[PDB]
Amino acid sequence: ARIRDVQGDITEFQGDAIVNAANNYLKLGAGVAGAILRKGGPSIQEECDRIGKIRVGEAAVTGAGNLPVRYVIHAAVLGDEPSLETVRKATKSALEKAVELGLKTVAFTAAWVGGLPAEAVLRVMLEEIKKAPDTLEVTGVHGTEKSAEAARRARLEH
Template sequence: MSKDWRAKIELRQGDLIDADVDAIVNAANNDLMLGGGVAGAIRVKGGPSIQQECNEIGPIALGEAAITGAGRLPARHVIHAASMRLGESTSEANLRAATRNSLRRADENSLKSIAFPAIGTGIAGFPIERCAQVMLDEVRAHLGGPTTLEHVDFVLFDHRSLEVFDRVLAGMKDLR
């Protein structure tokens, strides 16, 4: 694998719901209920159509991802990455699968750009360092194969999370 996968990744601090990309990724529960955290912000700014679409789709299996429209958000779609059950924690296996399946939904819909939060690190309590390792590993593997994605953003809520993702990305080796 060449090093060009790194050129497709951008890490930045900001508000995910303001990302102007083909799809933002919601750190979702498997019932696809837009409650608090990232999901709550998506519900409030995006409007009721997103939850209505989720109600028609959900529930989905843990580790799966579903795609909806984005309502009034700048993005065209929301990909709901189910890394946890409502009220429970995110596991590494579910985070890995939810990230992988989010990337697959992007390809299935011929999307060119996607923006992720640090899935599972808020209300679901997953450690930020391990989150960065798992998510960046999945993105690196995905970008190494055939994909429609040209740009993968990680929009991180605070400076500490950005520093962790920066450090993890800098330490990653290319796959052979």
């Protein structure tokens, strides 16, 4: 996969889909998830409700309502807990949806951490992203330029 990292508002991404780091209940909550809910509109939560509870590590696809993307891929990274193995699974699953749907571009919400070491999380996600096809471009979208630079450094290390 082609891998990018930029500073930005993920709700303004102009590509095929955004990957939303989710709870297994698929309830859109605070922060970025709340931006997606507000800008996208109620239809997103409504489809999430219809899909229902999923397993941690799995992903679910909904429409994106009024957002400038076509889909939101909800990757469930937390539920009734305790995981680095969980981030890997949710990342793998989200990328599988992107392939199945035949997407060319997706953005990840840079929440995936979950009290785990952030550098460790960046590393495991990069590993799964690299296994995705080169027909797919994956953009990590970061709230801060500092967060963006941390992702760039991890891709270098490596």
